[PDB]
Amino acid sequence: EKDLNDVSKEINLMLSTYAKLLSERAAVDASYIDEIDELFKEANAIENALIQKREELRQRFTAI
Amino acid sequence: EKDLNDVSKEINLMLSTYAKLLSERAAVDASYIDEIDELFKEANAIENALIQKREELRQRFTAI
Ligand SMILES: [Cl-]
């Protein structure tokens, strides 16, 4: 007794749910990229600061 | 007046902070993977269900 209209309803409901899942995946990716970007900026700042501390060591070794 | 001991302290502190950043990145990656995995399970369940609904359509089309 389940007819083509019933099956159509189910297909449309599932595709609606898929649209929500796609939107959720985009938001999750944006959040992840945001966190990774902050981490990368901080790691790069640590790297540059380490290069200048290595140059301070170098200057003191040259004074030796 | 800032001696090699001061520079050493600063380098060790920056590398300590870097270790914390690394563990934070690992946690961010685990969290991301957990969310992506749940999304993937849900999307695959939708896909299998849509295949099942396409077969229900197919059976009704065969019924003609
Ligand atoms: Cl790393």
Residue numbers in the entry:
A (entry chain B), B (entry chain A): 54 to 117
What do the authors of the reporting publication say about this deposited model?
Within the SC, TEX12 forms an intertwined complex with SYCE2 that undergoes fibrous assembly, driven by TEX12’s C-terminal tip. TEX12 undergoes conformational change upon C-terminal tip mutations, indicating that the sequence responsible for driving SYCE2-TEX12 assembly within the SC also controls the oligomeric state and conformation of isolated TEX12.
Instead, its centre is characterised by a stacking interaction of central Y85 residues. Importantly, TEX12’s Ctip sequences directly contribute to the dimeric coiled-coil, while 10 amino-acids at the TEX12’s N-termini were not visible in electron density. In the crystal lattice, hydrophobic surfaces of coiled-coil ends (formed by Ctip and the N-terminus) mediate dimer-of-dimer interactions between obliquely-oriented molecules. Thus, while we cannot exclude the possibility of the helical dimer forming in some context in vivo, it does not explain any solution state of TEX12, and likely constitutes an artefact of crystallisation.
